């Protein structure tokens, strides 16, 4: 097996999509191995640019094809370069721009903490014919940066592992184990936009819904709380588009459901207060003194749900 | 006829679109056949990478073109590889990423059960010149997984069949029958998101519409039920985008139509109660005691429609 | 002139767009002509796959370039194939996927009947050098099918004609007449979705607008009819996106305009009833008995407009 | 300098975008020049198709690269063709599909009159080495047609000019003047859709806003005019998407601003009528008789603004 | 090191996206260096077009690959050209169309001032093997122009610097310093559209919210201010799409938050005025005379926030 020494340089991470859980990584990859010595013009290394690499692979040069496993589509490989040294070592440099995909988990949605993963692996040569020695990831252009809404926290974690493939067990009997490099970058979402845009107005609307009890009539109370029903209908539209159709519920939609429950509870309470008249004349003050009980109960429900 | 032994490895299924009934399958295809023996360097097999396969097909190697029938666009074939063995057998490995399309049926929409189909077929050689022996589908990366909102249920069903083509009956008189491989993966939708997002608030709004009868006036009742008309207008917008313009109706839109019918029935009932005054003085209590009759009738209508 | 015998096989029609009046046709094209005899390996026909056709056109083979006239962009030609027979005849098979465009007419919008047109024509050789003998269109995969919302009615109509081109009259003096094949498939829209989604709720809202006269006040009538003004404002949004900005009006927007006219007529009528008080005391009953006159007048207006 | 005689054939103009001020032109280009004589097979002209032109440019044929200046992206050149005549003249035919861009001016928006411009120019050879003799534009397929919403008015205006380039003044000292062809097609927008969709309902809503004065109360007037405030808020959404963020204002948004001013003027007038009570008892009839003054004043303001 | 003399000609800047902070630059690049002399046909310079450059790089010509660092995707290089002079100097001209990306800062959003940056750099040769002598940027086509909504202010600032790369420090020990050219163009946003579209109606709605105190009731005040709550909910939708989810807040959203605070303050004030009745009979005039205090306080809050 030949020892290849990868050195990825993340130039930028952008386009971080949460609907499809993809992101775009732009950067450089530098693989380096050693082979039989050769004679170059002079004793200085020879730089062979893009589309001149095919004039050398045709003549018998060995350049492996390192692919990215977790990519969506194919990478947009721009320039590429091959440095040939007289002492016998080859360096393959390339520029990649990929739409990578990782399994994201938005259980906590506004205060979410995710990681971006690049997986690199030879396409043809297993670990008996090509092994990765080491990786250095030079993530210095995004070291502590706000990319669009993510803080990139700390360094990048690098790992080299062996993967078993079973569809190649019928064509390669005992050597189908492929070397693989995994690079993980930890990112933390910036919750400020959702705090001042999706949580403060929901707080104001729910507080206004609490204040419907201070009217001294009935039909005016019903009409006002139905208007607030319509208003909290609007926020389902306003928050639908930012996230995927997840089977679980996040914090933002837990407040939406709590707002629906509060509106419906207030309407049902004033309806039952209208029907509490056993003789048609009895006034209700114990159930209408929920002006201190309903906000405290909502705070307790919100606290037990958030805890 | 030469016997080709396909072995598809589904790496992932994603991007499952219901508006256009397409999905994206990313994976590997491994075809294997046998030919005349040859001399390789040594006695070890020879790996010929991408764009070096054309230097061999030009010299006279026989590599068939296996296409995907149900694809939208063309597959984004990334790397490809050709293993040539000294004993005479050839193995063609390729990586495919396709936007496939199948005929989906959303009669039941939130509890829907669908299947994803890959169809593979030679482009040029009929079953007198190329036959498929067997297929093993290695769907172990999506075996029991929630891809975005689908459970993948169990194994993958594989089939090999013969297809008649009639536009080639004028150019190939008696041999136009093409071998074909069909792979079906059964997926079950996850109804949780529609349960807590599109059914619970419609239930609350329809219950609030039931509670309009407990007012003791007339014009307040009319204004309140028209506000609820507007609110259920909003949910047509809110549910329009998730599905294709189907000629039939699903469960979600059956509840939308039931909500429209309930609002209009309540408005028409209170209008007829206002016009039931034969002398201008007669009060109505039998038709205004539908506070127990309207929810039970709605439950019976919903139950007979759902059954 | 050489006689080419085209045989198109429509595999599917999908993506039928009405905003841009394009559609996507996926299928196969099989052209067949005869030339000088040749020696193949044995006496069996020779199949030359994709990218091996260029090794034959370089050596002097004659393969014409048949283009599609009404295409948007360029076709996504996938595989292609060339069958060379020892008796001297050549067969060029190709797989095409095109975004074609035809002049659609949505005068009647929900009950619309359109046709999908494929036009095929040589790029370089006029009818003195290349003539089309016949076409057989094998539309058996979409024969009577609901593609997304269109019934495909019956067979496909095929035509072969000659087209004059006048920009080539300065470079080809008397022979600029190009052969052309036109294929027309008749499709009929499925009006069910618009019936139960865009016409039933507009009917309910217009009926509720008719029922505003049964109030016995004035300001309540004005506020209610302005709420219904807002509701029919919403349907302009709800129906804007499904169709192109046409200079004429369809059935759906004729109902939108009729709803606007009904709301404004009711508001103007109750305003004039408020101002009919010549002494400030005279009550109006003849103009307020339009509870039977307004729905009948709306039905007559709708019937004369639809007829 | 060699004399090239271009002959553009506009096949269709479509996709006319106003947000980005681009449009798509599909058609053919035919350039023709004369060179040294040559021997062809026989004495008939030789047709060299796509990808066979490179076998001739490698051997020393001179084919200039005519580019389009005002294009967005690169043209999607489909087929191309080269006719070589024994008398010594060459004809280069190509099919182009370009997203062209022109500086549009929507000062008058619904009754707008624009022109579509194609600019063609050699890439390498200045007018000392390549001159354009003439252009004939064969715009007969779009001569008087409604493309999507534009009438194409009359013929196409053709011009041949010389352009100075100053970045090539440091590499070409005295000859950097490039020949150029400009083709202008005049199109007139079809205002019918905006008349019956964006102007008639704004007229109805503004008329209903005029009719708020005929109420005989105060708070009902305030609530009604605030509902109409909300309704004219909706039309900002409804008209935002059809046009670019222009620094000036068009006719449609001038009516939106006039509607906002009318609603606010009516609200401020009834507020000042409520506060005109110097003793708390004085009734106002001169300022409340604006039921004839407000519509006439709005008509005068609209007329002076439109004139 | 060889001295390359770049000369960029910005043809246009368009497509300026603020959601993703990218923009599209279309133009020409002209690099020029000197080498060993050569014999051309005659003594006139030799123009080698696109795809004929590969016939010269194969024979041993030295053409460096200048890449753009801050690009998204890869540039859409259209035509390219190579001028070879007998005195020994080479000129490489190319046409580029790139989606470039720069770090934008929308702290002030409507009156924003940004700059568009092009960064150009050799891919393979460091500054010991390739140095940039100078750059002239010919930005005369966008000199003082309104591109879509940006004024381009003045000339373009050009800079040539040296960049250290550390992933190449393991393969190039002491010479990994790459020459680089940065071009900055200063653009100023045109605030007119946001002034007459997003600030004038928010001013009108906030003024109408100030005018809720002039009612002489309580429940009518509450219902009116809740309607204005709904109206300012709509503008969060109306302004969400124009900008990225920034952690800070701009001017437009500061007015949105001020409108929410004003509505909630008015509602809470009238609620506390209803509960100021210590005996159930005491009328409030000092707290209800905020008709002059609330607008002045809002003006002071807006002024201290804007300053």
Numbering used by the authors:
A (entry chain E), B (entry chain A), C (entry chain B), D (entry chain C), E (entry chain D): 11 to 317
Mind quoting what the paper says about this structure?
We began with the previously reported gain-of-function triple mutant V261Y/G319F/I320F (ELIC3)33 that introduces three aromatic residues at the top of the M4 helix (M4). As previously reported, ELIC3 caused a left-shift in the agonist dose response curve, slowed desensitization in the presence of agonist, and slowed deactivation as assessed by excised patch-clamp recordings from 2:1:1 giant liposomes. Interestingly, the structure of agonist-bound ELIC3 in 2:1:1 nanodiscs, determined at 3.3 Å resolution, showed opening of the pore at 16′ but still occlusion at 9′. The ELIC3 gain-of-function mutant further opens at 16′ with the F247 side chain turning away from the pore into an intersubunit space, but otherwise resembles the WT structure.
In combination with streamlined alchemical free energy perturbation calculations and functional measurements in asymmetric liposomes, the data support a mechanism by which an anionic phospholipid stabilizes the activated, open-channel state of a pLGIC by specific, state-dependent binding to this site.
